[PDB]
């Protein structure tokens, strides 16, 4: 008895306009989709929580809510799964489906409420990290690529 609600829920999210010119999951064919990408970003020279908080600040207005540096020095690797990475014949993207909230209804999924839970779970980091990976990967694959 969840099929109606669900079958209607999925589509609504598919034919949903991403940023601006066109872009909507439903417009993505197999060839332009790569699901669940697993990456490994080596990290030499200890990554200090504080040292990273600085630059993360200057460039990101989101990470302006500066509680950060909640982890401690780490040398090694950096695992990570990317729910989805696709291309709108021009560029590549980072999609992460996030099922969360019990926060009643709609009013909690507004451009404000969302950017709130963002720092709440410090997902912002996920961004910078994930993209830093796609960067390294695309640069690696696309022989002579630009950001």
């Amino acid at each position: 008895q969840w099929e109606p609600v669900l079958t209607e829920w999925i589509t609504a999210v598919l034919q949903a306009p991403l940023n601006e010119t066109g872009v909507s999951l439903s417009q993505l064919s197999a060839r332009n989709k790569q699901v669940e990408m697993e990456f490994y970003l080596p990290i030499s020279e200890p990554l200090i929580a504080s040292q990273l908080d600085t630059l993360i600040r200057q460039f990101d207005p989101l990470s302006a809510g500066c509680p950060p540096l909640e982890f401690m020095q780490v040398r090694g690797m950096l695992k990570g799964f990317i729910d989805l990475v696709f291309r709108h014949e021009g560029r590549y993207y980072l999609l992460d489906y996030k099922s969360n909230w019990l926060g009643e209804d709609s009013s909690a999924y507004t451009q404000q409420a969302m950017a709130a839970a963002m720092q709440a779970h410090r997902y912002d980091l996920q961004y910078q990290l994930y993209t830093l990976a796609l960067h390294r990967y695309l640069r690696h694959r696309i022989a002579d690529y630009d950001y």
């Binding site: 909640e70 982890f71 780490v74 040398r75 090694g76 950096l78 695992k79 799964f81 019990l102 990290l129």
Partner: protein, 50 residues
């Protein structure tokens, strides 16, 4: 009893680990990211009269 125990002159120093945006999410996911590598680790909780 003419004994004594070797005492190592080395030190811990550095620690090589393989983290993963887990340097963030505080534990509880202990053995969780182990049993299900792709579990929706971003969610958790109970539900009620909603």
């Amino acid at each position: 009893a003419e004994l004594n125990a070797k005492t190592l002159q080395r030190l811990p120093g550095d620690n090589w680990r393989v983290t993963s945006y887990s340097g963030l999410q505080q534990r509880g996911h202990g053995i969780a990211q182990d049993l299900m590598p792709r579990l929706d680790v971003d969610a958790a909780g109970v539900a009620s009269v909603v």
